[PDB]
Design a protein around this nucleic acid. Sequence first.
DNA 1: CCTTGGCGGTTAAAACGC
DNA 2: GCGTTTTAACCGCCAAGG
Lengths: 225, 40, 213, 257, 84
Amino acid sequence: ALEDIMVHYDGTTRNSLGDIIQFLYGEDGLDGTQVERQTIDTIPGSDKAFHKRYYVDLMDEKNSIKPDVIEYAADILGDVELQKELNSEYEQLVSDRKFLREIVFVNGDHNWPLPVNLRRIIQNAQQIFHLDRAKASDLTIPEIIHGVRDLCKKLFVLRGENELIKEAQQNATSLFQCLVRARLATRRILEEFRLNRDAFEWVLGTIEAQFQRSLVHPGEMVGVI
Amino acid sequence: EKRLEQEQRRLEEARKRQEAELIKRQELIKQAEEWNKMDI
Amino acid sequence: EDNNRIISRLWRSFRTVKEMAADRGYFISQEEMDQSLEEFRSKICDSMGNPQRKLMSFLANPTPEALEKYSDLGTLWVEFCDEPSVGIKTMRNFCLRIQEKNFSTGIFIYQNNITPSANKMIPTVSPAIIETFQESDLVVNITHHELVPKHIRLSDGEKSQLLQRYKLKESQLPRIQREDPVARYLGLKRGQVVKIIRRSETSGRYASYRICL
Amino acid sequence: IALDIEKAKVIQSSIEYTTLKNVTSATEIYYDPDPTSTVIEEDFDTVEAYFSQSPWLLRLELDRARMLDKQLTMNQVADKISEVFSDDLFVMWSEDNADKLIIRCRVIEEDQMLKRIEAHMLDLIALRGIPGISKVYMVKHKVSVPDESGEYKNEELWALETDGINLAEVMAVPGVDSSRTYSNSFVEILSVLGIEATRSSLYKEILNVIAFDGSYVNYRHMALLVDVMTSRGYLMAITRHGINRADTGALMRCSFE
Amino acid sequence: ELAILKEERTTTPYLTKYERARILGTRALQISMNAPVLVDIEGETDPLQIAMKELSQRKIPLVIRRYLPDGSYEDWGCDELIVD
DNA sequence: CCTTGGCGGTTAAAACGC
DNA sequence: GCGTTTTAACCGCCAAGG
């Protein structure tokens, strides 16, 4: 029954007649061998824990980034544009939490197979760049925000400038973008992982490259598999 | 406060649209009631 | 008693029909949407509590948004039939009523069953469209089920854009039957495409398309 | 209703199919030529108290224990019989305080006709409940729901599981969450809810079969299988009657069966 | 008509594993049939190894023609496809 | 799964009242 | 000869067995 089904070069899954079985293999376009169980961090926990983990306040001193982890802690408090950026990030995180908790995973399960292991990448970066020691990071908040935002737009599953193509491309990476934004939050990067700049560009490049490597290859005979 | 003002403007616009559509709907309701009376 | 349960089922069917008309693009007033059960008993039930199906018929016109998106959307006439069994005479007079009042679409809800002869004259009511529903299957709105995702009928331009994007032929899309319950809920005509946005545990959101038959 | 056992039991009683044969303990036919009196001394008191056509008397004794268990009323049974037979049969029923719950009937060579009517009565007299639902069980379900603080906490709720399927009728019963009723026969799901619901139900059934023994199969494989089975608008069985009825090449089709 | 212009090519810019295997096999066969070698050979003698060395340096003179389901195709040079 | 025979039924037409 | 009605052939739908 399933022998003549194959992933074509436009991403669709078709039989020998050319009839479409799926508009994207596995509904994400990934290969079955390139996925791993990962936890999406925005799903579990109470609202207080989520707020404590992800919210950053640049007006209140005791609810801000610790001063010993960043070199530029002096000229951060009182800035309003940077607070606008942080508020946009937090609103995106809250929207992701609502979308995952009310639509996709209603029962709250947060351990799902997803491509490119983020924890492994982060600890590899920490080992490579010697991210120990109480040294203060030189990674500005706008760099973090813009880097993650740009990364969430370079995960190409489908190429093309067509509007319908762009909509399908955005749909195909929703869960993975939620994972990436959950892990690479500003507070977590500056405090929990303590990445510096070079580690940050290395992490972004590695994520992009591994995602490109985890796609399905046109010519797979996925029906027989 | 600017966001609140914009929200209020959009709410007022939606209210006006709903009022206009209700005004249109009442004519159809009257016609339907008259025709149902005719059938009886 | 049994009168109360009959009235309740009739009210639920009325609410489902109004929701269906709203989904297909027509305009239903918000007050009429939330028209409660006690109000229904007040307006329909007589002194003995018996209902009149003839007092439930209504009319609707497309909203400006639906009219702009779908250019083929006319006026809709929904009528409930008092006769428990409908025959050729009743269907003929319903067709006459539709033709004389130039309604684009007519929905005719019967109670028990429809004779095959009445079924025969449904396709010859052109250009108006006559769709028949039973009272029993309208008690529950299936589109509110958990397992039923949201179906949205595609306009002609969107269908053309889809076929051009995938470089397809209409026979190469996944199909949905014309008698499919959601297809009859949406009033799908042969050759029309519905876009189904669906929950996916691998990507979160997945949009699928199906073509009617 | 989910968190209250009493209302759940009420719903369970309202759904389950119950016929006259379920509560009837024995049936008998007697000859009695006096409509205003009787020959049996045991039933003489009740009939005379009630009083204060053919001679063929048809009576039957209902089991009091199961009649009470099904929460039924003798008046309800008599009303059902009267509704299904109009005024073709005169019916008298003993009171609930009688030693034995009995109900008597009379027609208004007929012995064979009376036997056939009795068989029909035991056959298709439906007292209450959805037809086709033979048995109903109360089951406790553990569901994880976010708390008022956003934390996920387990919770126990009551639900019903039946034997036999009637999805359209059960979905319409008041007090039933009609937006979550589910069946394990996806043919009925196709006939009721459409084709996308059939796809989801088919995937759920396949995953249930595979994962019972703790095995794990990646999602995309089962997704591909259930997308193939429901790509034509109807359920395409994996047999010769499903595969060979496609438009594929003759050489490809002939290589299978 | 059927050919797709270089500006509007929408397939993946990477060499899939099937394309890599087929290209290596074809190049190895051609080298074994005395085709000119476009890279300097230090001490290698196996045609497959020479083909892999050519591929790593983007020197294979072959073109991949990727067939879309409708019959149209895209022509990609092996020197412009990214190889891992 | 298919043919088979049979069942049922509605609707029509020939015939009626009147 | 207008309003009405009956049996009638006829019609399709459906259950059973090969």
